[PDB]
Amino acid sequence: WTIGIINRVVQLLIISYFVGWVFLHEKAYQVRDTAIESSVVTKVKGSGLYANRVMDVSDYVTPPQGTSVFVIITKMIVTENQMQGFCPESEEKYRCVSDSQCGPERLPGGGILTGRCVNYSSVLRTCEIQGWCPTEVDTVETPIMMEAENFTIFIKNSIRFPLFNFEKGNLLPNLTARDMKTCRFHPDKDPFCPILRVGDVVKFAGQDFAKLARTGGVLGIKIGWVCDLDKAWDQCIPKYSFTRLDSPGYNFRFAKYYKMENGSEYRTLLKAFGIRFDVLVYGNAGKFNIIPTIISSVAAFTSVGVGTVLCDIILLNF
Amino acid sequence: WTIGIINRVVQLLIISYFVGWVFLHEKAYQVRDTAIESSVVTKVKGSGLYANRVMDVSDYVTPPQGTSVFVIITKMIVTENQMQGFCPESEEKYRCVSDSQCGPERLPGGGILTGRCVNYSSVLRTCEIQGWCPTEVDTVETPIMMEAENFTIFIKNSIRFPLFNFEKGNLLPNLTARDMKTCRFHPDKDPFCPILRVGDVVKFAGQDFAKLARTGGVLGIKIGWVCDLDKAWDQCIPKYSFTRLDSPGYNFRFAKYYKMENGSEYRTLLKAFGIRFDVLVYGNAGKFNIIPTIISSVAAFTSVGVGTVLCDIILLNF
Amino acid sequence: WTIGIINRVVQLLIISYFVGWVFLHEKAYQVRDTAIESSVVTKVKGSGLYANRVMDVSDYVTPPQGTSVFVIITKMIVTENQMQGFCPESEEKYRCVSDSQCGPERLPGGGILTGRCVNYSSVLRTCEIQGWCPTEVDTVETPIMMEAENFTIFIKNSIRFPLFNFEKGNLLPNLTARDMKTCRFHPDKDPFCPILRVGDVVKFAGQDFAKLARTGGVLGIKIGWVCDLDKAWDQCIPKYSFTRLDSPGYNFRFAKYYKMENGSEYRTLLKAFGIRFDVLVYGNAGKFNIIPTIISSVAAFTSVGVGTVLCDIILLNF
Numbered sequence: 001w002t003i004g005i006i007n008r009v010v011q012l013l014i015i016s017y018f019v020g021w022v023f024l025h026e027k028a029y030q031v032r033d034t035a036i037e038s039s040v041v042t043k044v045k046g047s048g049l050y051a052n053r054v055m056d057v058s059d060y061v062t063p064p065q066g067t068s069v070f071v072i073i074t075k076m077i078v079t080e081n082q083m084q085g086f087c088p089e090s091e092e093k094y095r096c097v098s099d100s101q102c103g104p105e106r107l108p109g110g111g112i113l114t115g116r117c118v119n120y121s122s123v124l125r126t127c128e129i130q131g132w133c134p135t136e137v138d139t140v141e142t143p144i145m146m147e148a149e150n151f152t153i154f155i156k157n158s159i160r161f162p163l164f165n166f167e168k169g170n171l172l173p174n175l176t177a178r179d180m181k182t183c184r185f186h187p188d189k190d191p192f193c194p195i196l197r198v199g200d201v202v203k204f205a206g207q208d209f210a211k212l213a214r215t216g217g218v219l220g221i222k223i224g225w226v227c228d229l230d231k232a233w234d235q236c237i238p239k240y241s242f243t244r245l246d247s248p249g250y251n252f253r254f255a256k257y258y259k260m261e262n263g264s265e266y267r268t269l270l271k272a273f274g275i276r277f278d279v280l281v282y283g284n285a286g287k288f289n290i291i292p293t294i295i296s297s298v299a300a301f302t303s304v305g306v307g308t309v310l311c312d313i314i315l316l317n318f
Numbered sequence: 319w320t321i322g323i324i325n326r327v328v329q330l331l332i333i334s335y336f337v338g339w340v341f342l343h344e345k346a347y348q349v350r351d352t353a354i355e356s357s358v359v360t361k362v363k364g365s366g367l368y369a370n371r372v373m374d375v376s377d378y379v380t381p382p383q384g385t386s387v388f389v390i391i392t393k394m395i396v397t398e399n400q401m402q403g404f405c406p407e408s409e410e411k412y413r414c415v416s417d418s419q420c421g422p423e424r425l426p427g428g429g430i431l432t433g434r435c436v437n438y439s440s441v442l443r444t445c446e447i448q449g450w451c452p453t454e455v456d457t458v459e460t461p462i463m464m465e466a467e468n469f470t471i472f473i474k475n476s477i478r479f480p481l482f483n484f485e486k487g488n489l490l491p492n493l494t495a496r497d498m499k500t501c502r503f504h505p506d507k508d509p510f511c512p513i514l515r516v517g518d519v520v521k522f523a524g525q526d527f528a529k530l531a532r533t534g535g536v537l538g539i540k541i542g543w544v545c546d547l548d549k550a551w552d553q554c555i556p557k558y559s560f561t562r563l564d565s566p567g568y569n570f571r572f573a574k575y576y577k578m579e580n581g582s583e584y585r586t587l588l589k590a591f592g593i594r595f596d597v598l599v600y601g602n603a604g605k606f607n608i609i610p611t612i613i614s615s616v617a618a619f620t621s622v623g624v625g626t627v628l629c630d631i632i633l634l635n636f
Numbered sequence: 637w638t639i640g641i642i643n644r645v646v647q648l649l650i651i652s653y654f655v656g657w658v659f660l661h662e663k664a665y666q667v668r669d670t671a672i673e674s675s676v677v678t679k680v681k682g683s684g685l686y687a688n689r690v691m692d693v694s695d696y697v698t699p700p701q702g703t704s705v706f707v708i709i710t711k712m713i714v715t716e717n718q719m720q721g722f723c724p725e726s727e728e729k730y731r732c733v734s735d736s737q738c739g740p741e742r743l744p745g746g747g748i749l750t751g752r753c754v755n756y757s758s759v760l761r762t763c764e765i766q767g768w769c770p771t772e773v774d775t776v777e778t779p780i781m782m783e784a785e786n787f788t789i790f791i792k793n794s795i796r797f798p799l800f801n802f803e804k805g806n807l808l809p810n811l812t813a814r815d816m817k818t819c820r821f822h823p824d825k826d827p828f829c830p831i832l833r834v835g836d837v838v839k840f841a842g843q844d845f846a847k848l849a850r851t852g853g854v855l856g857i858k859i860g861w862v863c864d865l866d867k868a869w870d871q872c873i874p875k876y877s878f879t880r881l882d883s884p885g886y887n888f889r890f891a892k893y894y895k896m897e898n899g900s901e902y903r904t905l906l907k908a909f910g911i912r913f914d915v916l917v918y919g920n921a922g923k924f925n926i927i928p929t930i931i932s933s934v935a936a937f938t939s940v941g942v943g944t945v946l947c948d949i950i951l952l953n954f
């Protein structure tokens with residue numbers, strides 16, 4: 001009967017269309033390269049005021065070289081003119097009543113205990129220690145550099161998909177609305193401008209610059225390179241997203257080492273709180289390939305061939 | 319004959335069970351994301367004694383920012399108060415008999431030869447050089463900071479599988495037996511505590527803290543995120559492993575730059591030996607997908623369909 | 637007719653050979669690990685002359701620890717003995733006629749404007765600023781350290797394919813023609829020597845050491861680990877390539893902080909131009925697997941089964 005082939009032909013049309021659209025949607029004919037090879041060069045620009053000091057890129061940015069992870073220092077604690085010696089620790093956790101509770105068995109690790117219980121002040125009695133004196137008092141409150149919100153981060157990112165040897169950069173003057181020197185990334189108005197406003201990045205990550213600068217934190221500027229290398233070079237485009245990674249705070253210690261004319265050594269101990277920026281470059285490209293196209297083909301051919309049998313059994317049996 | 323279908327039905331039962339278990343074991347129905355996106359923040363805590371000095375996190379940890387690669391300095395060589403000028407190199411390799419063998423053709427690279435053969439000491443005669451004087455003597459023996467074995471490394475790791483947008487952290491209070499502030503990673507007792515004892519890490523890597531601190535080395539704290547994103551969020555868990563990567567030693571040079579009241583410059587040249595720690599975050603997730611499930615399906619369907627024919631030929635023919 | 641099976645047998649021979657060679661060529665029977673886990677330790681050696689100074693590894697290499705990204709400083713701009721205060725900016729862009737155009741609305745960001753229009757020199761009138769004085773003059777011309785071309789970069793790279801737990805290093809004495817201490821990488825003569833001549837690396841990237849050292853730049857030493865883990869351990873070999881990533885220049889600012897006997901602070905501000913080296917380790921391994929071998933098998937079986945039908949229709953119909 002002719003209807004049998006009109007039923008089978010309709011079966012093949014519909015089923016093959018479902019299968020066809022499904023496989024065509026997931027790019028099942030594409031080999032995928034998920035090992036992007038990225039290079040990131042960052043440059044921060046701006047100046048702020050902290051205490052009665054002016055902070056420039058050499059004062060608050062660390063490291064200086066412009067790596068994928070850098071820190072803009074917003075608040076810091078200074079302990080000036082430390083020198084090796086003996087002094088009573090100011091931390092209450094080191095409180096003692098006699099030299100019998102200042103032995104090595106107490107607080108394993110941490111500073112060096114001399115073994116004497118000494119009077120840091122009139123209100124506290126702590127174990128004496130050998131080290132940089134006086135000791136640090138990290139419980140005080142200090143200001144924060146507010147101008148850091150208005151600093152700009154310029155991110156140059158140069159990636160390459162090695163499986164296809166397709167390399168490209170994120171400096172795209174045609175895609176930017178304004179000049180490169182004066183543009184400013186906006187997810188909607190200028191999403192390809194490589195210049196980011198620090199405060200903007202803080203907003204895109206859903207963070208308050210006040211609290212963040214106060215406690216420090218870790219934000220991620222995410223550069224995504226989802227690309228179809230079957231399409232034009234113009235189609236491989238970076239997409240920027242932002243996130244807070246510590247989800248607290250972020251601080252680190254470093255000293256400025258000075259020496260006296262008589263040769264003795266003394267440092268300025270600095271506890272730095274700031275916003276660390278981690279440029280995280282993800283990317284995956286898909287290029288047409290014979291092998292995935294053949295495997296997907298056999299899959300769709302056989303799958304339709306079974307679906308028509310099952311549909312005949314489900315339809316005819318009913 | 320009915321037995322023919324009882325033979326075929328048994329064929330399908332057994333063969334389909336083998337195939338079924340095989341494909342089900344390898345998660346052939348899963349798409350895999352092998353491009354983990356990790357952020358690592360490390361913090362070292364402890365204090366040691368070297369010479370008649372006390373070393374704190376600001377003295378032996380470099381860099382200070384808490385990156386994925388950092389160095390705990392255990393031994394160092396100091397050459398204090400160097401100044402630009404001329405002096406005889408102390409390295410024997412520069413030995414000379416006359417100014418005729420101190421020309422640019424000799425030892426290309428390395429220091430700057432003035433062209434004069436001068437007497438470094440009474441027992442050695444070396445080419446004179448222009449540079450930081452006096453020259454370094456890197457053949458002496460120095461102590462090592464033993465307290466560095468008892469230092470603790472706290473590793474905060476925040477990763478994300480972008481193909482599935484599944485992000486998670488390694489701070490898991492429910493998985494840790496003890497408090498986060500006081501716990502200590504143990505592969506068996508507390509394998510999810512983010513606080514690692516330096517000496518412990520040295521043991522897990524099969525290394526002697528004595529020899530390692532003496533010669534320096536490169537160890538890797540490996541964080542693995544093998545996850546089945548078909549299962550619960552609770553099931554995606556990090557697994558820590560450890561390894562020595564240099565498999566010798568590790569050292570680097572840096573100077574402390576001082577200036578005189580009259581303006582002349584002089585530095586303290588420091589050759590640092592320590593234990594560099596590289597946090598290596600691997601991970602791959604598998605989530606159910608229609609495409610891999612269909613491809614594997616067709617594969618198992620056809621494979622059984624051929625195995626039954628071949629088994630009929632092998633069985634019936636015999 | 638026997639010819640029908642001689643036609644079919646020839647069909648299967650030819651078609652199956654095409655399919656067979658195609659699938660065998662792309663290693664369709666292999667699972668692939670594209671998430672290499674690499675560790676990179678770099679060491680630069682050499683000395684240069686800049687001004688009347690001698691630069692050693694402690695002077696021009698930054699950072700010192702030997703990471704995968706480092707910088708060899710070739711040219712720099714020094715602004716010595718800066719101190720917080722007020723002074724007229726030397727940048728023409730800050731030119732003013734009266735204090736009415738030195739308000740916060742002008743040049744948002746950048747230095748701190750006091751609000752006064754002052755005379756930097758007799759030929760220029762600029763807004764006065766609070767900060768490190770005097771201000772920097774980054775428009776002068778300075779020499780470049782030519783010896784940096786002859787420096788050597790030693791790259792120790794230790795990678796691991798985690799999916800197969802196959803770890804290996806790039807120090808291969810058997811593959812190197814000369815001794816490790818004296819060899820020198822040459823793409824043809826010694827392509828496995830880990831010691832690279834800076835000038836050589838500059839040539840392999842198609843760059844002029846003169847212009848590059850003058851303006852600075854970003855080069856990439858690419859280490860590729862394409863490996864067939866079905867073959868011998870000896871067959872997994874690294875291949876080095878080179879590229880310029882900025883495709884201008886590269887510079888960064890850092891200061892040397894000094895303190896006076898009376899306690900006031902003053903720094904030497906340094907703008908550094910150099911060649912940043914980024915070690916980019918790519919790699920992917922392929923190991924025989926049952927699942928990819930079965931999927932490819934079904935694909936080739938079915939594909940031949942359809943090609944023979946289509947070829948019968950194309951041949952017989954004609």
Ligand SMILES: Nc1ncnc2c1ncn2[C@@H]1O[C@H](COP(=O)(O)OP(=O)(O)OP(=O)(O)O)[C@H]2OC3(O[C@H]21)C([N+](=O)[O-])=CC(=[N+]([O-])O)C=C3[N+](=O)[O-]
Pocket residue numbers: 041042043044045066152153154156181195774854881882883884885886887
């Ligand atoms: N907020 C910002 N506003 C303006 N410029 C900013 C900003 N942040 C970073 N930059 C960098 O500043 C460089 C131009 O400097 P410019 O502001 O005109 O002059 P300055 O006198 O202030 O100092 P400079 O030229 O940086 O030494 C560009 O170099 C690069 O990135 C730009 C660059 N570029 O934009 O062309 C490409 C590049 N690579 O690698 O392709 C590297 C740069 N870099 O490292 O600065």
Ligand SMILES: Nc1ncnc2c1ncn2[C@@H]1O[C@H](COP(=O)(O)OP(=O)(O)OP(=O)(O)O)[C@H]2OC3(O[C@H]21)C([N+](=O)[O-])=CC(=[N+]([O-])O)C=C3[N+](=O)[O-]
Pocket residue numbers: 138218245246247248249250251359360361362363384470471472474499513
């Ligand atoms: N051996 C160690 N013992 C105790 N604390 C240690 C140790 N190593 C590192 N830390 C970090 O120390 C922080 C708590 O400091 P705590 O010891 O209580 O106070 P201190 O007065 O000694 O100095 P501090 O608070 O660090 O400035 C925590 O912050 C963090 O990691 C912890 C942390 N945390 O544990 O909650 C989360 C975090 N991120 O990003 O989520 C970053 C930290 N960090 O950078 O230190």
Ligand SMILES: Nc1ncnc2c1ncn2[C@@H]1O[C@H](COP(=O)(O)OP(=O)(O)OP(=O)(O)O)[C@H]2OC3(O[C@H]21)C([N+](=O)[O-])=CC(=[N+]([O-])O)C=C3[N+](=O)[O-]
Pocket residue numbers: 456536563564565566567568569677678679680681702788789790792817831
């Ligand atoms: N152009 C170069 N010529 C000669 N040696 C150079 C050069 N660049 C770097 N190096 C490193 O120099 C080390 C040997 O030093 P050597 O030149 O003999 O002695 P020096 O007195 O000059 O100073 P040093 O031993 O480095 O403190 C080796 O250590 C290592 O890499 C080698 C090394 N190695 O070559 O055996 C293995 C290693 N890891 O991790 O396996 C790390 C090294 N490293 O960090 O220097």
Ligand SMILES: *[C@@H]1O[C@H](CO)[C@@H](O)[C@H](O)[C@H]1NC(C)=O
Pocket residue numbers: 146147148149150744
């Ligand atoms: C950032 O720039 C805006 C623009 O004029 C300014 O109003 C604001 O005060 C600046 N932020 C700080 C902290 O000075």
Ligand SMILES: *[C@@H]1O[C@H](CO)[C@@H](O)[C@H](O)[C@H]1NC(C)=O
Pocket residue numbers: 174234
């Ligand atoms: C950028 O714009 C110019 C227009 O002058 C065009 O010729 C060029 O092809 C464009 N490049 C890309 C990558 O779009």
Ligand SMILES: *[C@@H]1O[C@H](CO)[C@@H](O)[C@H](O)[C@H]1NC(C)=O
Pocket residue numbers: 260262263264
């Ligand atoms: C160097 O002088 C300072 C005070 O100027 C003093 O505290 C120190 O003890 C002196 N050096 C030595 C080794 O005594």
Ligand SMILES: *[C@@H]1O[C@H](CO)[C@@H](O)[C@H](O)[C@H]1NC(C)=O
Pocket residue numbers: 108464465466467468
């Ligand atoms: C490390 O801690 C243990 C615990 O008391 C102590 O016995 C040992 O001396 C410490 N190590 C060093 C080098 O002091």
Ligand SMILES: *[C@@H]1O[C@H](CO)[C@@H](O)[C@H](O)[C@H]1NC(C)=O
Pocket residue numbers: 492552
């Ligand atoms: C952690 O423990 C609490 C128990 O108070 C539980 O409610 C929570 O769901 C747990 N979270 C995870 C991720 O296991």
Ligand SMILES: *[C@@H]1O[C@H](CO)[C@@H](O)[C@H](O)[C@H]1NC(C)=O
Pocket residue numbers: 578580581582
């Ligand atoms: C500065 O003084 C030191 C000794 O105090 C001396 O060696 C040096 O020559 C002086 N500076 C100059 C430029 O001579």
Ligand SMILES: *[C@@H]1O[C@H](CO)[C@@H](O)[C@H](O)[C@H]1NC(C)=O
Pocket residue numbers: 426782783784785786
């Ligand atoms: C590099 O080495 C060669 C080899 O002798 C030498 O001729 C050349 O002058 C050196 N380069 C510089 C900048 O000195």
Ligand SMILES: *[C@@H]1O[C@H](CO)[C@@H](O)[C@H](O)[C@H]1NC(C)=O
Pocket residue numbers: 810870
């Ligand atoms: C290196 O050479 C030696 C020859 O003495 C040989 O025994 C060894 O197997 C070789 N190793 C490799 C990895 O080729």
Ligand SMILES: *[C@@H]1O[C@H](CO)[C@@H](O)[C@H](O)[C@H]1NC(C)=O
Pocket residue numbers: 896898899900
């Ligand atoms: C310290 O001395 C310098 C000159 O030697 C001077 O400029 C400065 O004002 C002095 N310190 C203070 C706080 O005045």
Ligand SMILES: [Mg+2]
Pocket residue numbers: 091135136137138
């Ligand atoms: Mg304290």
Ligand SMILES: [Mg+2]
Pocket residue numbers: 409453454455456
């Ligand atoms: Mg020497």
Ligand SMILES: [Mg+2]
Pocket residue numbers: 727771772773774
């Ligand atoms: Mg300027």
Ligand code: NA
Pocket residue numbers: 295296298299613614616617931932934935
């Ligand atoms: Na298939």
